[PDB]
Structure formats: structure tokens, C-alpha cells
Design a protein around this motif. Sequence first.
Motif, short mmCIF file in Angstrom:
data_model
loop_
_atom_site.label_atom_id
_atom_site.label_comp_id
_atom_site.label_asym_id
_atom_site.label_seq_id
_atom_site.Cartn_x
_atom_site.Cartn_y
_atom_site.Cartn_z
N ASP A 87 1.15 -1.18 -0.56
CA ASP A 87 0.02 -0.16 -0.06
C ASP A 87 0.84 1.12 0.00
N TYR A 88 1.83 1.34 0.40
CA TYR A 88 2.82 2.52 0.35
C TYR A 88 3.30 2.86 -0.69
N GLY A 89 3.81 1.79 -0.98
CA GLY A 89 4.72 1.54 -2.53
C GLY A 89 4.06 2.39 -3.69
N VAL A 90 2.91 1.82 -3.97
CA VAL A 90 1.39 2.49 -4.72
C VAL A 90 0.84 3.70 -5.02
N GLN A 91 1.19 3.85 -3.98
CA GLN A 91 1.70 5.68 -3.65
C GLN A 91 2.28 6.04 -3.71
N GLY A 119 -14.03 23.20 -2.98
CA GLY A 119 -13.92 21.67 -3.71
C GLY A 119 -13.35 20.74 -4.02
N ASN A 120 -12.29 20.09 -4.75
CA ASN A 120 -12.11 19.05 -5.46
C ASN A 120 -10.27 19.74 -5.59
N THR A 121 -10.43 19.30 -4.07
CA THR A 121 -8.68 19.16 -4.28
C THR A 121 -7.67 18.90 -4.80
N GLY A 122 -7.96 17.38 -6.12
CA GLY A 122 -7.07 17.18 -6.85
C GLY A 122 -7.14 18.38 -8.19
N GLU A 123 -8.19 18.52 -8.51
CA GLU A 123 -8.87 18.97 -9.42
C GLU A 123 -7.51 20.72 -8.71
N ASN A 124 -7.05 21.68 -7.87
CA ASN A 124 -6.51 23.28 -7.54
C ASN A 124 -4.94 22.14 -7.38
N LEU A 125 -4.60 21.26 -6.40
CA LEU A 125 -3.42 21.15 -7.08
C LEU A 125 -2.64 20.69 -8.24
N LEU A 126 -4.23 20.95 -9.17
CA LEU A 126 -3.86 19.98 -10.49
C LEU A 126 -3.98 21.62 -11.07
N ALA A 127 -5.07 22.56 -10.48
CA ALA A 127 -4.42 24.37 -11.59
C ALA A 127 -3.03 24.81 -11.11
N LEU A 128 -2.27 24.02 -10.03
CA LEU A 128 -1.54 24.22 -9.80
C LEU A 128 0.18 24.57 -10.37
N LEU A 129 -0.53 22.52 -10.91
CA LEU A 129 0.73 22.10 -11.67
C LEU A 129 0.78 22.43 -13.17
N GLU A 130 -0.78 23.07 -13.95
CA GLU A 130 -0.66 23.49 -14.89
C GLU A 130 -0.78 24.60 -15.67
N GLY A 131 0.20 25.22 -14.97
CA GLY A 131 0.49 27.06 -14.85
C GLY A 131 2.25 27.11 -14.76
N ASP A 136 -5.49 8.45 -17.41
CA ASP A 136 -5.11 7.79 -16.61
C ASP A 136 -3.94 7.24 -15.92
N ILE A 137 -3.77 8.55 -15.00
CA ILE A 137 -2.69 9.30 -14.29
C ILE A 137 -4.48 9.16 -12.86
N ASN A 138 -3.52 8.30 -12.04
CA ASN A 138 -4.23 8.08 -10.32
C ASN A 138 -3.04 8.97 -9.56
N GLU A 139 -4.87 10.72 -9.10
CA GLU A 139 -4.39 11.57 -8.64
C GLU A 139 -4.27 10.91 -6.94
N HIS A 140 -5.22 9.71 -6.99
CA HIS A 140 -5.86 9.60 -5.52
C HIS A 140 -4.81 9.15 -4.85
N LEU A 141 -4.02 8.77 -5.14
CA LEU A 141 -3.20 8.35 -4.25
C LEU A 141 -2.16 8.38 -4.07
N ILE A 142 -2.15 10.05 -4.42
CA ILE A 142 -2.09 10.97 -3.93
C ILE A 142 -1.91 12.02 -2.75
N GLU A 163 -3.59 10.75 -0.38
CA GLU A 163 -3.87 9.97 0.34
C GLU A 163 -1.91 9.75 1.83
N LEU A 164 -0.81 10.54 0.72
CA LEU A 164 0.42 10.63 1.14
C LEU A 164 0.38 11.69 1.94
N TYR A 165 0.18 12.74 1.58
CA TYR A 165 -0.21 14.26 2.79
C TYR A 165 -1.31 13.74 2.54
N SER A 166 -2.66 13.32 3.27
CA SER A 166 -3.53 12.77 4.19
C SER A 166 -3.57 12.72 5.40
#
Lengths: 85, 205, 82, 70
Positions: B49-53, B83-95, B193-199, B201-204
Motif C-alpha cells: 500500500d505504501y509503495g503504490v502511492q 472543491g476538489n483538492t485534486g483539481e486545485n492541485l492540478l490547477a497549480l501543476l498546469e501553470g 490514466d494518472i491516478n491522482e487519488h493515491l497522492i 492519501e500520502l499527504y492525508s
Amino acid sequence: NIKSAKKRAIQSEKARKHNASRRSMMRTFIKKVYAAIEAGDKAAAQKAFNEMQPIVDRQAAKGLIHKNKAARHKANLTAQINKLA
Amino acid sequence: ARYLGPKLKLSRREGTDLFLKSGVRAIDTKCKIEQAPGQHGARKPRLSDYGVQLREKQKVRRIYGVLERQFRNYYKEAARLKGNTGENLLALLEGRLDNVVYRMGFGATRAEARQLVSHKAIMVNGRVVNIASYQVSPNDVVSIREKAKKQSRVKAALELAEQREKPTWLEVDAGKMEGTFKRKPERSDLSADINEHLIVELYSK
Amino acid sequence: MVTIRLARHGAKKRPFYQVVVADSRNARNGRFIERVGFFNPIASEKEEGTRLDLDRIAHWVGQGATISDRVAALIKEVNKAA
Amino acid sequence: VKAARERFGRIVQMHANKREEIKEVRAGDIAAAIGLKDVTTGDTLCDPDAPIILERMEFPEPVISIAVEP
RNA sequence: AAUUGAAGAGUUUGAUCAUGGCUCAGAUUGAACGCUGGCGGCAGGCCUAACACAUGCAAGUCGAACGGUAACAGGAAGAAGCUUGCUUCUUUGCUGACGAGUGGCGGACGGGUGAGUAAUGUCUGGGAAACUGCCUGAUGGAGGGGGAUAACUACUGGAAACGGUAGCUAAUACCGCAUAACGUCGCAAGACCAAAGAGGGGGACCUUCGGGCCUCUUGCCAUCGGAUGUGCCCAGAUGGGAUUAGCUAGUAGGUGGGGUAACGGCUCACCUAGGCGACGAUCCCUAGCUGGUCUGAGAGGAUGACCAGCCACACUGGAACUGAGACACGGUCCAGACUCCUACGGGAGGCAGCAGUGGGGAAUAUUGCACAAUGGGCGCAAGCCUGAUGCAGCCAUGCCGCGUGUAUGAAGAAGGCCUUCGGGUUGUAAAGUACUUUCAGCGGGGAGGAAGGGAGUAAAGUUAAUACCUUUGCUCAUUGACGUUACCCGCAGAAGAAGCACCGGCUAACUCCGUGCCAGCAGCCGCGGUAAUACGGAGGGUGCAAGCGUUAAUCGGAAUUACUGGGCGUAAAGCGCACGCAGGCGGUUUGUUAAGUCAGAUGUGAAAUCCCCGGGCUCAACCUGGGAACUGCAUCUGAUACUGGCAA
């Protein structure tokens, strides 16, 4: 000692010898009314009350008394003689 | 900062083709993809579980170039973005500037597109640009300085990306080396294709 | 004599000034009652860069408030009588 | 000779033993710098970071082996 | 728009569950040690001995106060090297200007270090018994005299420091009488109290030819007020310990005098015999405090390095002076400790100011630069003084980034490494080839932080005034420590720039080989028995990255002191059992103030800070704008269900 305005330490005891003389000049006439309190004449003190009455108010004016000890000392002494009458 | 190493092991240890050794001839044929990365890893590890994140963590940290010290602070401000913290983190990775010029066709990879960013060759919205951590805002256009436009390597890299589908949140002109930025990329717009859901869970924890 | 004068903020080699009311012995970036505006020397004409609240400058001098020569220079550069 | 980069406090030259100070290092004088930590005896030092003119000269040998008791 | 934030896993046993300590993954450091090391920007950088301190430097200024003129610069009576005024020169203080002295003001501001102190303190509300230099508004006045005195001379002591005596004289220095009120004392009468003058310009008048005279500027003095810096009192909180149970004699209180600017046992005199405390007194230890920071779901804990407020302190101890204000960091005197100059009488001194020295220590900076910025003191201004600061040095200590190059590149080289000795792998890695070179390095253009000030003209007011002073724009020539600044263009070349921890599980990453409970490994359970994925090296990866590990410390996880939110039959835990005054709670009914609780309003809750939405640094860090927060406290006025008091 070391600073260029060390003459202030010369001017202090130059001043203090004068002001403590005016202190000494003031107090003896506040003392002088307390000479004749214990005698029993209401005007013997009152005549000498008018001897410090400028002098404690010249020296409130010259800059030593803070105007309120003079208001103190001309009030108790005036009621000092009037306590007996 | 940068890796600057043998960065197709990084596509071999992770398996997915996240765009590093792209070049002109897009098929690789020299790496033996989906294998052991080295000399002893012939067995398939268990992937707990640790390594798949951790394994998809290398997938997001290598597309755009963001390191460990840089990815963590993006999460911190994103937690207050609603809202969706995955979208807001993606809002910072696409600038990123190496993000946009890679989505502009300029560059056969991110590193060659880092090179044109690293060597002063970008102008954005009336300012000649600098440091590649610049989050590029909407209602801005991108351009190239006149001394470093069309120098023997921008041509064929623009070809293999004009066969790409031109993901319509930013428009490229590419005939005078300018593009346009409109707005943010949503979850409906990437490869998915990118699972953002396991990122998260690391910073949870 | 509590005065109206300048005080200092900002960063290394890029100032930004914070105008305040204070006694003129009171540790220039320190004790004070009420700031009324601020000043930026690197004015940067996009939005702002020197703002003054004039109606307290007229009232503090109503209690006496001998101004400094730079805050008075802000009065000549705010166009007070315009 | 030790591979370390140090720095200066001053240079001192004495007249009688009069430590009258100076900031000018004239080629052909002698100086007495101050507060350098790990300066041994016999170190060949270089100010503009050039290759040294290496000098190794610590070769008399003590003759007595006597122990102490503080 | 502005609280969308709470997870666990290993570890006792053959195995399971529970209990319960242990330990680990997070974050944060004022950091340190070791390894290694290119650059830019932003902050911070002696915490340990408030240890002892060499050296230099941190508070001076006004001549528009004056007597004077010691240097220096002109000029002037006069006067020549004899180049017939190109000038040598003693005199005069007519001026500039001013060492020195007197004098006005500052020196209590800023700065620096937390040793004391558990409450005279701080914080946060509320006060009543005061003052207030500089500042400002309004209101009266600002007359006329005088005696000393340094400096400066005569003579002169001493090694020096530092002085000595007789004289003489000026001043916004000092002291007098007149004259005083909406100022003071007193029930009412009445009784007393202030000071000043310098400077600029100018018309008649006036000329003893200093000027008098008019006037502007600046200035003094008395007082009512305000801003205000400050003093004082009260309530509630503000640490641990009961193995700290009684403490106190000006101690509780009154009267009377005195006291300080102000109120009080603040202090004497006498009377009364109480005051405080088990709702924690006194005694003891430790410690500055708050806003706030660190963590945390929250409540709470730990902690107040940098920042700002308040307090305290100035080698130790004490006292009082001057002043608006001190019981005074760079002041007086006395005393002590320890040092320094000495020609041996006698003399000094204060870095818990900046920078530094030795030492202490795991540990922490130039014996730096400039007053251009802002603030301050003095002064009319010009300026001077400014180690306050603005910068600038050293430091991967920290918070953020830049770059250390890139595409192509299979015969899938060499070499290394492992191996059914077939092969695979390191590895598109390198070489090779095509570009490019941000910062480099280097060469030059080159904004802003600069606002003012001074010089000239005119106009608007003042007045006899077209003068002066002030003001208003304009005109002129200049003021930058930083600075080889930021930043742009251009040059040849990828050339100078990658390392550190880890690999049994926790927790992502392997086989040999070399030692054989030897040497060693480690945060935790535990490995090593010649026949190791835990040891050492090599290779293979891994995580990170100009930083990386370890070490120390607070919080978390710890529901591991559990109010929020735990348990006590057997796991630690129910006194051996009753009685009982403090103390804690309490059945039901009616009325009642509204203590408690509750609503609403007002004022406070400094700013920064955390948070929300933006601006500016090119972006980030950082620096800010508006706003929110500040979960609180007090006070005013309302409600009466449940509690309390009150009464039946």
C-alpha cells in the motif's frame, strides 16, 4: 566625566549652592512662623506669616516650589492660628 | 534540482510512457519496456500500500519536472482552495512554463522545452520571461524572442505535436511561434490514466 | 509635541513607508497611535502607491501635530487644494 | 598544505614593540597577521589562489624522551 | 470570500484477545557535528559567564545671546620687493567665521542585557486625588535699576591629573522695587506674586552721528484649556510545592501635625486590639511580561530568539542633587571589588553601546562604509552631530528558486557485474552527430530609491514701504554610501558547477563475495554457528538533492492525567469499618429582586501576526492594500424556564 557637557556637573553644584540657599532662605521663614505658634498671639504669627508670604511665593515663582506646597503651607498655617480662635 | 540522468529507466521502472524520451522516432525499440530496471529485479515485487502511492508519485513528479521540495507546498495552499483538492492541485501543476511550452509543440520533450525556457527564449505578455516555476495566468499570450526563434531544432518537434490532438484549453499559432492561454485544465481534459487519488492519501496522513 | 512624520518598512534596497502619528522621541519604527495612510517610493502606476487620509491631518494639527518635511512634501504631491 | 581557506584580521608591524597598524602589504616587508585559527609552523600560503612554491623544511629531530606528571 | 478538518504500524505469547508501557512515520528548530559543495534573492545570525575587559568610536549644538578672536579668510589706517599702486608688513576685531569660557536646550531619546521580582510588576477592564518641558489656541503684559562672576591679566603649585589667590567686566546668567488679573490663600475682608531681550531692513525726522524712531521676523512672561508624555489606586486572572501551618508589631484602624505635584501609616504622637490565612496565608524554588510564535481537528500543551508595547537594570551597595521629567547606561559624592599611568607625592575607571580580545562553550559575524534615505537633538536657515539606521562583509543556519545542458543515438561498445556459463544487464547510458550556453567568465549601454535645499524673477499679503520676512509656481546649476547596482544587448565554448542517507520488517529499493556469536550491526523486534538480502567492499537500484544524514528540544500520534474524552471483581486502582463539623449537591407549591445564565447596543480588544480576496517584486519566498479575526472583558437596559438567595 568623559563627555563634552561635563560642565553640567560643574554647573550642577554651581546651581545647587544657590537653590539650596533659597531652600534655606525659604524654610527659615516657614520656620519663623512656627516660632510664634506656641506663644499664643494670633497676630504675632500673622505678622511673620506675611514675611514668608512673598518669599514662598517668590520662590514658587522663581522655580522651586511646585505652586501646591505653597497652597498647602499658606492654608494649614492660616488655620493653625485660627484653631485656637 | 534536475535529474539529468538516464531518464528512460524512469519510464522502465514505472512502466507508463510519461513522455520523457520522446524525440522524433516516437517508438523506442531500444529499452525493453516492462522489464526489470537493473541486474537483479527479475521477479515481480508485491507492491504493497505504501509503495503504490509512491510509484504513481514518480509519475506525477516526472511529467512536469517538479521535485519533492516543490510538490509539497503546492498541496498546502490547495487545501484552502475549495472543491476538489485534486483539481486545485492540478490547477497549480498546469501553470508551469515548461508545462505550457510542452503543450505548445515547442520542444521534442520537456528538457528541450526546458532549454528554450532556460535560455531566455520566451516572452510572455510583454515581459521577457525568467525562472521556470512561473505559474502562467489566464488572459496571457506566449511568444519567443527574435534572436532565438527557428534555430534548427524547433521544426520537427512542432511536427510530432501537430499530430497530437491540440488539447483545447490553450491555442497555438506555431507559424510565428506564439500561442494563447485561455483558462484552467479540468479533470475532463487530461489523459485520465494518472491516478491522482493515491497522492492525496500520502499527504492525508 | 506629538508629531506627524514618516516611518519605514519594506525590504532591502526597496523601501515602503508607513506614515504615523507619534511623539518625536518614540523609536521611529515603533510606538504610535494611529497611522493615516502610507507611502511607496517605487510608486508603480498600476493601482496605488501613496495614499493619504487628509481629514485626520487637518484634525491632528487641530491639536497641534507639527508635521515633518516629507509628510508636508506629500501634501504638495497629493494636490491637497485640488 | 592543509587545504583550507582562511581570512585576515589585520597585519601588524612593531616599531619598538609599538603595534602601529597598517593595511598595506608591501612586497619585501614582514607582517604579523592576527586571529588565523589553524595556521601551523611551516605552511606555504597563497593569497591570489595560485599554485604554491612548496617549501618543506621541518627537519631537526628532538633527542630526549622524558615523560611528565602534572 | 474569510476554522473543509481527527488514519497508523511494529513490539510481551506456540497462537489469540485485552491491558499497557516502549518505539517509529509528521511538523518545527535562534541550532550543532560529520560528508560534500556552483549561483541569485530574502530573513536571521553569544542562547553558556549580568564573566574579566586592551584599542577606536557611539551626543552634540546655537555667535540670529554675549564678553572675546586663539587659528584661518578678507578688508582696512598705513605701507613697497623699488616689475610707479603686480604688493613685504605691524596694527583693527570693520566683517566672515569662531578653539576656549559663561549661557539657553538636550544629555532620562534611541541603543544594549534578562540577574532580580510571584507581585509596588505585566495584561485586560475601570477609575480620582495630579503634573505636563518641547507643541498649540485664545487672553493681559513685556517699565525702570543694581551687585557679583568665569573667561581674560599679575604671581604661581604639580610628574601629570588638576588647580591656587587678589583684581576687573559682559550676557536671554543671578538678584531687587513698581505693577498685577477671569492666578493663589482665606466664610467673608483683604493680603502677595512675572519677565528680556537679540537680529533684518528702511523714509522724513533725528544726529551725543552706538542710534533713538516705525515695522517685520524671532523670543520671553502670567493664566485658562487641549494633544499629551507620566505618576497613583481597585477588581480578576498571572507558576510549581502542604514532605511550607500558622504569620504579623507601623503590624490592621481612628484622632492630630507633618509629608509629596497628587491620595494613603507615606511618617511621628496617643488610643483600640485587631489584620491575613485550609476559597492555599506566610516560607521555599524557579522565572521578566504581553501581543504572539510551534504544534494541534478542537480543546489544549510547550514556549516568549528576530518584531512592537510594558517592566527592570547600568560592576556591587546607598543617598540626595539638577531638571518639565532621573534617584540618571556613556552624571555627583561616599564605600567595596578588581585593574591601569607614576618621576612613587598622589591619580583614575565602567562595553548587560557598535566592532572586537582572552577565556567559558556542541555552538554563533567586519577591530567595516556613508550620512543619499527616514527618525532625532540643537539652531533662524545653511549645516553639524548621528555605530539610531541605510547598506555593506563573513555563515548551504533557515525560508524559496536558478543552473549543473539538450534532441538524435543499437553493433544494444568497452569495462564491470551476475549467470541453466546459452544469456541478460549497467545502458540512450557513453562515444559519435546537430544545436544551444541562463548564470558563468567577460565587454559595454543603463531606470528608480531624489523628496528637498540653494541661486534668480515676478506676483499675492504685512507696513510709511514698490524694503525685509513669508508664500506661490517657474527658471538655473547641482546632491547617491550602495555601484565593476538591478537590468538589456553582444562574445567563444557545454567548456567551471553532484553529491549525501538507505536496501530483513516497520519503510520504497538485491545476489554474490569476504569474515564465522570472531570483528562488527542498530530507532524498534533482533542478525553473525565457516552452509548471511540485517556485517565489510564491489556492482544493481532507491529517496533526496547544493544540500544530506545524525544529535538535542517542544507538540503530535498519546483516548498515555481522558472538562471536550479514561478506568478501579480478576490486568496498576474502593480507605479495615462506621460517625461527623467544614465542603459538595438536593423532592414539591406560591410570590419576589434578578445574583447565575440569556438577548441586544455601545466603547475597548494597539499595529504587525494567522486567515480571505488582490496589487508589486518577472514568478516563488518575501513586501504590503482593503477587509475579516481578535473566539475576550466591562458597562447600560431588558426576559423569569431552570438553578441560588429571600419569604410563606
